[PDB]
Design a protein around this ligand. Structure first.
Ligand SMILES: *[C@@H](C)C1=C(C)[C@H](CC2=N/C(=C\c3[nH]c(C[C@@H]4NC(=O)C(C)=C4[C@@H](*)C)c(C)c3CCC(=O)O)C(CCC(=O)O)=C2C)NC1=O
Ligand SMILES: *[C@@H](C)[C@H]1/C(=C/c2[nH]c(/C=C3N=C(/C=C4\NC(=O)C(CC)=C4C)C(C)=C\3CCC(=O)O)c(CCC(=O)O)c2C)NC(=O)[C@@H]1C
Ligand SMILES: *[C@@H](C)[C@H]1/C(=C/c2[nH]c(/C=C3N=C(/C=C4\NC(=O)C(CC)=C4C)C(C)=C\3CCC(=O)O)c(CCC(=O)O)c2C)NC(=O)[C@@H]1C
Ligand SMILES: *[C@@H](C)[C@H]1/C(=C/c2[nH]c(/C=C3N=C(/C=C4\NC(=O)C(CC)=C4C)C(C)=C\3CCC(=O)O)c(CCC(=O)O)c2C)NC(=O)[C@@H]1C
Ligand SMILES: *[C@@H](C)[C@H]1/C(=C/c2[nH]c(/C=C3N=C(/C=C4\NC(=O)C(CC)=C4C)C(C)=C\3CCC(=O)O)c(CCC(=O)O)c2C)NC(=O)[C@@H]1C
Lengths: 177, 164
């Protein structure tokens, strides 16, 4: 757990440097794009059970062998452990975008995830297509590009904010692949 | 590192909660105060050697005994190390200001200071001397604006209550 600003002082400390005008200028843009970043986190959080039921159901309609006996989303305990897991990934994605930095996700979610997954037997190949659908959903909710749900914002550009959510989802894939 | 955004996420995380409105209302406060603390940060980052010098000199003008044999500024390698600690501390006050949270001063400068200065016979009074002088030098249109001066002045009061 670090954010956008402590990232810059962690980096300045190592070089035994006070925070420089240019670094200080990277931080002003994040001050400038602060109201949009809250809107981006608001749209994920307000459609959060949606992103997750569709992620998990997408995975399933693409691999029915998951709800077969011995498939890891077979029994209800199991269907539920996986919606629960997708609910945890999205929450740390939401946290990371709030911080403007990935470390809470890395430390508090992604550390140990592939390993633990090997032991329980849960299929990391099907885990990655849940996370990819989630990404596709999150990216388009902060872009107000969702098929069924459009909101009214003052217009402007949020593609930068879309790129880092995709990037937090990509981190998750990378760590279990 | 304690900041506004770290302290809401850890708490939400503790509760296993998604972020809500109180968490978005909190981060907006950080953005309302960013201007005034980055202003102070810029000013100390720009002319820091000048203020650390001033500040160093002040402990020795108050505590000349440090120069005595057996004491912490008996020679120049030592005196040089005192001015380097006032820069270390002022680089941490510049860091506290950018982050808008005392976490940098807490982790890297305050934690364990008390054990290190006791073992190595460095008086906390002498470091307090420096920070009071640095704190009270500030002239609040001259050196920076008023509200950045609030940030500077009490970023330093936080250090003084830590040593006393
Ligand atoms: C098989 C039965 C299928 C399911 C289930 C499935 C799921 C895929 N979702 C993909 C993208 C996506 N999810 C949503 C959710 C959504 N749309 C809304 O407007 C609201 C409200 C909801 C939540 C309930 C969104 C926002 C998207 C983006 C597409 C869009 O026009 O909105 C997706 C595609 C993945 C990709 O781009 O790689 C699925 C797969 N599809 C099945 O086959
Ligand atoms: C759909 C997403 C996939 C799926 C998942 C699945 N998860 C488990 C069990 C666990 N997974 C976790 C991981 C975490 N819980 C946390 O506390 C956190 C934060 C670091 C995460 C992300 C843990 C620790 C477990 C073990 C204990 C538990 O079940 O909660 C299961 C259950 C497996 C079992 O049979 O016991 C499942 C089903 N299953 C799929 O098919 C997916 C591709
Ligand atoms: C991409 C995210 C979408 C987008 C965003 C967009 N928002 C604004 C302007 C504002 N954003 C807010 C909203 C919030 N900030 C808060 O204080 C809170 C916390 C509880 C929220 C939810 C506010 C207050 C404003 C306008 C008023 C103000 O001056 O503060 C803009 C306009 C430019 C800007 O950043 O000020 C934009 C671009 N717009 C899109 O087009 C998106 C898909
Ligand atoms: C004037 C203020 C005082 C002075 C100081 C003095 N410092 C040391 C030794 C240390 N001081 C530090 C402090 C820091 N190092 C850091 O990394 C940080 C945080 C990022 C700070 C602020 C530490 C940890 C030490 C120990 C290691 C070292 O030798 O530098 C000395 C040397 C002690 C000795 O006697 O050998 C001195 C001289 N001296 C004075 O006159 C003051 C009271
Ligand atoms: C109002 C407090 C009193 C006042 C002040 C005064 N300051 C100086 C000169 C310096 N004081 C500073 C302080 C800082 N410079 C910075 O950039 C920062 C930011 C971290 C601070 C707080 C420094 C380092 C100097 C020396 C450099 C310079 O000449 O600018 C003077 C000049 C005369 C002198 O040194 O005494 C004055 C006039 N004037 C008063 O008497 C006030 C009540």
């Amino acid at each position: 757990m670090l954010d956008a600003f402590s990232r810059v002082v962690v980096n300045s400390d190592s070089k035994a440097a006070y925070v420089s005008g240019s670094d200080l200028q990277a931080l002003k843009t994040f001050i400038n794009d602060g109201n949009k970043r809250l809107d981006a986190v608001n749209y994920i959080v307000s459609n959060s059970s949606c992103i997750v039921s569709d992620a998990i159901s997408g995975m399933i309609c693409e691999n029915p062998g998951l709800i077969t006996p011995g498939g890891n989303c077979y029994t209800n305990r199991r269907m539920a452990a996986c919606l629960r897991d997708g609910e945890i990934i999205l929450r740390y994605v939401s946290y990371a975008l709030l911080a403007g930095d990935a470390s809470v996700l890395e430390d508090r979610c992604l550390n140990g995830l592939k390993e633990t997954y090997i032991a329980l037997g849960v299929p990391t190949n099907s885990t990655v297509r849940a996370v990819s659908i989630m990404k596709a959903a999150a990216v388009c909710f902060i872009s107000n590009t969702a098929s069924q749900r459009k909101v009214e914002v003052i217009e402007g550009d949020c593609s930068a904010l879309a790129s880092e959510v995709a990037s937090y989802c990509d981190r998750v894939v990378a760590a279990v692949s | 590192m304690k900041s506004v955004i770290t302290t809401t996420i850890s708490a939400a995380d503790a509760a296993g909660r998604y972020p809500s409105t109180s968490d978005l209302q909190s981060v907006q406060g950080n953005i309302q105060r960013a201007a005034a603390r980055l202003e102070a940060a810029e000013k100390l980052g720009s002319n820091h050697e000048a203020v650390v010098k001033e500040a160093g000199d002040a402990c020795f003008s108050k505590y000349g005994y440090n120069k005595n044999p057996g004491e912490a500024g008996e020679n120049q390698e030592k005196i040089n190390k005192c001015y380097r600690d006032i820069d270390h501390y002022m680089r941490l006050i510049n860091y506290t200001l950018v982050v808008g949270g005392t976490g940098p001063l807490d982790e890297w400068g305050i934690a364990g200071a008390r054990e290190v200065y006791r073992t190595l016979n460095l008086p906390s009074a002498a470091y307090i001397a420096a920070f009071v002088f640095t704190r009270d030098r500030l002239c609040i249109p001259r050196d920076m604006s008023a509200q950045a001066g609030v940030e500077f002045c009490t970023a330093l009061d936080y250090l003084i209550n830590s040593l006393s």
